[PDB]
Structure 1
Amino acid sequence: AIASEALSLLSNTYVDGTEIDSSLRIRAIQQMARNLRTVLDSFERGTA
């Protein structure tokens, strides 16, 4: 259950085909991966 992160992730949807926004992309890749690692670890522990 989360809404702020989803809204932030889906609020861009690009504009017209501009650059990749390397800083924002790197920040998102770091944060989402860090959250997903522990999320999947907890899910695997629960399933086991």
Structure 2
Amino acid sequence: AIASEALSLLSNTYVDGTEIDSSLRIRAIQQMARNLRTVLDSFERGTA
């Protein structure tokens, strides 16, 4: 799942040329990607 008021940021991007590019992107993108790859490696694992 993805939580509301945080699923809303990745449901669409209305930003254009953000000034502070590091404040609220990596704590969202990395935090969600460490999960988006756990679900993928889950298929790599459940075969065993």
**Higher share of residues assigned helix:** 1
Alignment deviations for residues 7-47 of structure 1 (CA, whole Å, 9 cap, x no partner): 33246632565436321111112111110121111122346
Gaps of 5+ in 1: none
Gaps of 5+ in 2: none
What TM-score do the two structures reach when normalised by structure 2? 0.49
Aligned identity (percent) is 100
Query: May I ask how many residue pairs the two structures share in their alignment?
Result: 48
Q: CA RMSD in A?
A: 3.2
